[PDB]
Amino acid sequence: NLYFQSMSVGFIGAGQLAFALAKGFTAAGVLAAHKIMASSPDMDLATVSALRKMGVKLTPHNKETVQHSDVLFLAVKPHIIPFILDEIGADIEDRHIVVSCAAGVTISSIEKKLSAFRPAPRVIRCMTNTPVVVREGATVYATGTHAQVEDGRLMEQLLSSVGFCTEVEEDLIDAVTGLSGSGPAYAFTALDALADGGVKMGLPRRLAVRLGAQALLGAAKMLLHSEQHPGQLKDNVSSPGGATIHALHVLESGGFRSLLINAVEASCIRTRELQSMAD
Amino acid sequence: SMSVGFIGAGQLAFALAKGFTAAGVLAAHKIMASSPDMDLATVSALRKMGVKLTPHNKETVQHSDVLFLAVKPHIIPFILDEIGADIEDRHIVVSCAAGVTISSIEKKLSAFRPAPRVIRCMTNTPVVVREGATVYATGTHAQVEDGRLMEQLLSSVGFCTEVEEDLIDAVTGLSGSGPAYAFTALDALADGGVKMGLPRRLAVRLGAQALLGAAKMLLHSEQHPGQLKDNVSSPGGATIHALHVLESGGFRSLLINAVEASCIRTRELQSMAD
Amino acid sequence: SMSVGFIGAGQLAFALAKGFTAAGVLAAHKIMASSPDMDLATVSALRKMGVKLTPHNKETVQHSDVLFLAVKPHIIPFILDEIGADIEDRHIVVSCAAGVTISSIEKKLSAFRPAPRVIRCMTNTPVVVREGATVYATGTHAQVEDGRLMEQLLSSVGFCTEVEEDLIDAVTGLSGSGPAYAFTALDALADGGVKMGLPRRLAVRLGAQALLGAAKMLLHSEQHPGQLKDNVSSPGGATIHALHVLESGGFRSLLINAVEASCIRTRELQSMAD
Amino acid sequence: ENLYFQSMSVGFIGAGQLAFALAKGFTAAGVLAAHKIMASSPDMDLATVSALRKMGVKLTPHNKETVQHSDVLFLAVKPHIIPFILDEIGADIEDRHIVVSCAAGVTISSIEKKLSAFRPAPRVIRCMTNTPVVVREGATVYATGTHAQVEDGRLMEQLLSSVGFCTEVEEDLIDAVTGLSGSGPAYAFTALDALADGGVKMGLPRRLAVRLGAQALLGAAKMLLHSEQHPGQLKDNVSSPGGATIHALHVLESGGFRSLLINAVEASCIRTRELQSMAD
Amino acid sequence: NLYFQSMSVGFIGAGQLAFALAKGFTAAGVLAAHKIMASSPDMDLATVSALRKMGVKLTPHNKETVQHSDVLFLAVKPHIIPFILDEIGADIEDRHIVVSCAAGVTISSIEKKLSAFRPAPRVIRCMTNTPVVVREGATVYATGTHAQVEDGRLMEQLLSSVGFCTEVEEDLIDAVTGLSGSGPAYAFTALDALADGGVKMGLPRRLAVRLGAQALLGAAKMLLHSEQHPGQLKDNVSSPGGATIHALHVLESGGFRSLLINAVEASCIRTRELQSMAD
Ligand SMILES: NC(=O)C1=CN([C@@H]2O[C@H](COP(=O)(O)OP(=O)(O)OC[C@H]3O[C@@H](n4cnc5c(N)ncnc54)[C@H](O)[C@@H]3O)[C@@H](O)[C@H]2O)C=CC1
Ligand SMILES: NC(=O)C1=CN([C@@H]2O[C@H](COP(=O)(O)OP(=O)(O)OC[C@H]3O[C@@H](n4cnc5c(N)ncnc54)[C@H](O)[C@@H]3O)[C@@H](O)[C@H]2O)C=CC1
Ligand SMILES: NC(=O)C1=CN([C@@H]2O[C@H](COP(=O)(O)OP(=O)(O)OC[C@H]3O[C@@H](n4cnc5c(N)ncnc54)[C@H](O)[C@@H]3O)[C@@H](O)[C@H]2O)C=CC1
Ligand SMILES: NC(=O)C1=CN([C@@H]2O[C@H](COP(=O)(O)OP(=O)(O)OC[C@H]3O[C@@H](n4cnc5c(N)ncnc54)[C@H](O)[C@@H]3O)[C@@H](O)[C@H]2O)C=CC1
Ligand SMILES: NC(=O)C1=CN([C@@H]2O[C@H](COP(=O)(O)OP(=O)(O)OC[C@H]3O[C@@H](n4cnc5c(N)ncnc54)[C@H](O)[C@@H]3O)[C@@H](O)[C@H]2O)C=CC1
Ligand SMILES: O=C(O)[C@H]1CCCS1
Ligand SMILES: O=C(O)[C@H]1CCCS1
Ligand SMILES: O=C(O)[C@H]1CCCS1
Ligand SMILES: O=C(O)[C@H]1CCCS1
Ligand SMILES: O=C(O)[C@H]1CCCS1
């Protein structure tokens, strides 16, 4: 029974993430679409067209988003953030909570830019992922220097309506980016390959995609609702000498586990590397 | 009414001049190319087509309105110092050299006359069959009509779109080097056909036709390349068995490696220039 | 004046009917296709084009002069037992099924009427953009004009040549499965473009255009694919660096592996049929 | 012929494998009398020295004697020895000398800098050759230095063409030539050893396998040199569809055979550049 | 000063090998081109066009080649040999020496076919390679049951005019096929790759191809003219710590030697496998 009646939300940037969050927020019923505004310099985007059909207000002018909004999501690519902050810094007011969703971009770099215009900008940094669009996101956030305690509580309330959400220290966010930020892409890759495996063994592609996705969804839910180690859940599937343990062996023979560690590491390191180039 | 020149009379200049004249947008007599070796195979070819040839880059500049630089990247600075005093208000200088930045070209030419009109492009050899892939970036002093003239000319020999200059090194790694990746693949596919009993000539023809048709399908489709792949393979069938052996060798990762390596080498060469 | 039927209304039947009608060689109303699932996506598409649809394979046979079999290979014997008593002296039966031999088809149809006119072909999905690659072999009772009619029809949607039947399983591994190899390559090349900073849409477009143009160059050239590769790479340049990383992963061997695996699976499936 | 009646005196500083191979080639070509060649080394107990002596080449421990004897003077010592050599006999280089450095990686610039401290216009040529000059099938490139006369390059090409292929190049290609044709014979000997092992594994006597493998390589190389066709086209002409050769080419491809040869040319070229950076 | 004045040579098959041998024989001066006849069912072949320009007599009819010829080379693909022998078996005469160049095809299988028409066919089996076209071939031959001692001597004389030639026991020929029969293709592959290596390091392709080919030619000649082991010749190239030994290491790290053994083995095994399918 959650609903933010006095809250206006804006998105600077109207792409994949702004669409996913706006769709998730409106489906959760915590925000009416007409209380959301998004800005983009390209109104011929498929996400812009989708946001319009939801009822979200659209404008080319970032200043209009700022003037409309209380909670302001920065949903542009990381290298665009400093340009955005230069553009609307003079328009940030005491009432604004600035939530940066940009990969890698530090609270410090945002606060430095905005502080040149008005002291004490209220800044929150978050890392989320596209499954907020089906209200099953994974979101972490860190509060900035001037964020009030009620600001973090409000953001956790809002972002919990579209999936898991918890506060972290900011120095964990680049690693979260490599795990759950990039994570859905690892899963989409895995599901494409599992479906290819099903097709190879005789299944129609449509059925293979449905079954592989249901298997992943079910297993993830089991782990979330269980207190047992994933190794123990794995042990429950494989009967001695059976089909599953034969398949697990071929995964191990290819270093399957190491590839996933490699992936989380590479996304995290690239996230750190990009920000060091920014600074 | 346009007059076009090429500094350099090698593979790219031939490919572009053959495409332009085949497209009809340019008559061979409006094209002049220069090279210090007038006994080159490509120079002989351009002569048969009707293109004017000269050893003197100054003559090419004097006749051209649009001037293409089609020499190797390390030669661009030498060329710019030889012809810089000959550039005029009318000239559009189109650099085709891999890696060479608009800034480096504009710096050299500005020592002689301010506001040189510079465009940088990355194209590829299939312009010779009017199926090239071309991107271009406009310089500080290019007029808006300069970019439109450029896009009109290069669209006649393939795909053409404007990009920001900071994308061009990556384009080089993808569509600039791309034809070589395809020629390697076609040689190997033909070897596979021969191993399974096909005459070499038929294998080359079938492999090339298969790649051409698939590329055309993807260009004409709004569907994802993975969806088009799913349409080929029946469950349990021959295609999905072959796709597995490609995946087992990391086929996808090799092509990613290639684009990266070409792009990185392009960036590395230009850092050496600067 | 020709009437064409398809038994099966799936991906291949759609692709061939779209190519035929786009080529102008066949009006959509002269084509009938049958399928047991009239709520298929491809069946809806054929209906929009003007193709006649029916659930009854007998109706397709009754209207067709040329009859394409475009069902999965394990279904061919079932189809031949359902329609065998309906084949006539006028019919040319064109089997498109992977692996299925002319001998197996002629044996089944001969139980009903002697001298069935049978042609086996291997084509691919790019017939839908009239750039298919098709081979065909004529059966024991096909007249000489039957092969010429077949080549005329299939040349309208791509390359077409007659082969001995014992080459068709290898052709399957090369140009039949080939589009899937190209779609995989194009997905990966686009990923490489994105890694180096290109938007995904531009990377897909440039990669596909590069492969299309290179394939067209090879088809229009008498030069060896290795010679065309040599023309792309400058000494020390970006392309030769990328070619090295392809060679280091055994890129060529993977494509040979793929053709072999598809051909072998085709042979294996037909041995299972027999 | 014309070079023979030129009665050239040749010297080698260094009496090792390259000096032996060149001396053997020049004398077998009839361009030089063995006794018009002089070679020096501090180690007069080397096998190459005994072979040179048996040939009739003049041997001396004293590099100055080689210089004074010579009209064309080959520097055939290890790359890191070249600067010591140039310090030692630099004062003995005369205006009549053509100094030909064979040393891997050593630049014309580095040599001219040493020698210019003594006479102002030392005539320097840099070359890269290989051991098959010993059977007059060498592969040789050379670049002319700042003060080499046009006749000096032509004389050098005449001389080195008598023992194989020879062509002028820009100096900045020579490190790459080193990795290809300089080191190349060692790749070929490795390949010939391995091909012979393959012959032996399949049942051939070793002597026959070595002979057939070497003859195969020689004939294939000669074909390519005498053909205007691409090596891939010549390869295509060997393999029938489904046949033995295309099966063998597949297993080469599956091992990255091509990439190994690229790796080798690269590795030798890079090592050549890396040593010279250590020098300069 | 060799010349076979009373010898007429025929080729059944007018493809790559017939062209290479006819070009080699005529360049050696041991045969006039007009004393050579070749037959093929396809007179629109590039090799047929090349043979015509040399002066070689051409016919579509294999029977004409047989009637013209004394020495008859079978230069068709191995699976065509039994069809050929059926076709012209009745036309073999006492004077004919039948030389089969077909990979894998045994003397026994040829003699069995031809003996059904006339006893004691004179059969020689040979394995050669395309460098006979530059008179640097590598050829072995085995004499059949009814070949006279002068027949082998004559064939060794003829084939020695286009390269190395020696007699072997027939059971060595499949292995020779894997080594020197297929060998030129291994070399063309190696030269293409070496040239790519030169281009990568800055050489023009034309120069790189010329230098790589000269290097291989020179090294092979050195080995042929030396009594030393190839390992010893290799040692003479590499100075301690130098460029060559660095390159040899990277070849060894990739198992370069094993790939060449693999190749000879695979060609030999395929040659045996094909013939077992023939029989
Ligand atoms: N897509 C994902 O999976 C997630 C993305 N993120 C972060 O969200 C941000 C955006 O990601 P996507 O939405 O995927 O990017 P996207 O590229 O889909 O949308 C980007 C939007 O920014 C707009 N834009 C460009 N310049 C602008 C300007 N000057 N003012 C306003 N809008 C401008 C573009 O027109 C486009 O609408 C990035 O920083 C990314 O790290 C974080 C979590 C997950
Ligand atoms: N060939 C390709 O696939 C493409 C090449 N490019 C770029 O085009 C340029 C040349 O490419 P290619 O034509 O392949 O090189 P190329 O080597 O075939 O032709 C180069 C031409 O420049 C001439 N040249 C050398 N010095 C000269 C001088 N001082 N004045 C005038 N002409 C001179 C050479 O004689 C030769 O004719 C390079 O910058 C390359 O990056 C870009 C896209 C594709
Ligand atoms: N899709 C491709 O890339 C190509 C496929 N082929 C061959 O074409 C045939 C089919 O290929 P796709 O169209 O991809 O299969 P598909 O599965 O897309 O269409 C198969 C059609 O057969 C219909 N069908 C099933 N049982 C039937 C019956 N008893 N009577 C009539 N119709 C029936 C199915 O309902 C479906 O519409 C296969 O033999 C395949 O080897 C050959 C070349 C290329
Ligand atoms: N061996 C080869 O394959 C080729 C060698 N080269 C170059 O030729 C040069 C020598 O090569 P190798 O003859 O193989 O070396 P090597 O070591 O066989 O002969 C070197 C000779 O230098 C002599 N030497 C050492 N210090 C000396 C000094 N202070 N004064 C005079 N002589 C001295 C040694 O005693 C020995 O006789 C090297 O620079 C190498 O890069 C280049 C082309 C091919
Ligand atoms: N190309 C090579 O590197 C070498 C090939 N060989 C052997 O030589 C034989 C031929 O090899 P290539 O010449 O490369 O084949 P190829 O395919 O170049 O020439 C084959 C010739 O046979 C002709 N032919 C087909 N049916 C015929 C018939 N019924 N009567 C007469 N001629 C007919 C074809 O029209 C063509 O002219 C094969 O058995 C092969 O094993 C042996 C040593 C080396
Ligand atoms: O014992 C096994 O592995 C079976 C149970 C899980 C699916 S297969
Ligand atoms: O894989 C399949 O189902 C067939 C499709 C066309 C070539 S093989
Ligand atoms: O490799 C090269 O020399 C350039 C050719 C076009 C793309 S990069
Ligand atoms: O077709 C082939 O591969 C044979 C040719 C000569 C060596 S084996
Ligand atoms: O010592 C070395 O390896 C040099 C001699 C051969 C070419 S490079």
Swiss-Prot record, chains B, C:
Among SUPFAM superfamilies, the record links this protein to: 6-phosphogluconate dehydrogenase C-terminal domain-like, NAD(P)-binding Rossmann-fold domains
Phosphoprotein recorded as keyword: yes
Provide the binding site for L-proline: 165, 238-239
Primary location group: mitochondrion
Q: What is the regulatory mechanism acting on its activity?
A: Subject to competitive inhibition by the reaction product proline. Subject to competitive inhibition by stearoyl coenzyme A.
Pfam families given for it? Answer: F420_oxidored, P5CR_dimer
Query: What's one GO-annotated cellular component?
Result: mitochondrion
Q: How does it assemble?
A: Homodecamer; composed of 5 homodimers. Interacts with LTO1.
Protein family (similarity comment) = Belongs to the pyrroline-5-carboxylate reductase family.
| Known role | Oxidoreductase that catalyzes the last step in proline biosynthesis, which corresponds to the reduction of pyrroline-5-carboxylate to L-proline using NAD(P)H. At physiologic concentrations, has higher specific activity in the presence of NADH. Involved in the cellular response to oxidative stress.
- Can you say what this protein is called? Pyrroline-5-carboxylate reductase 1, mitochondrial
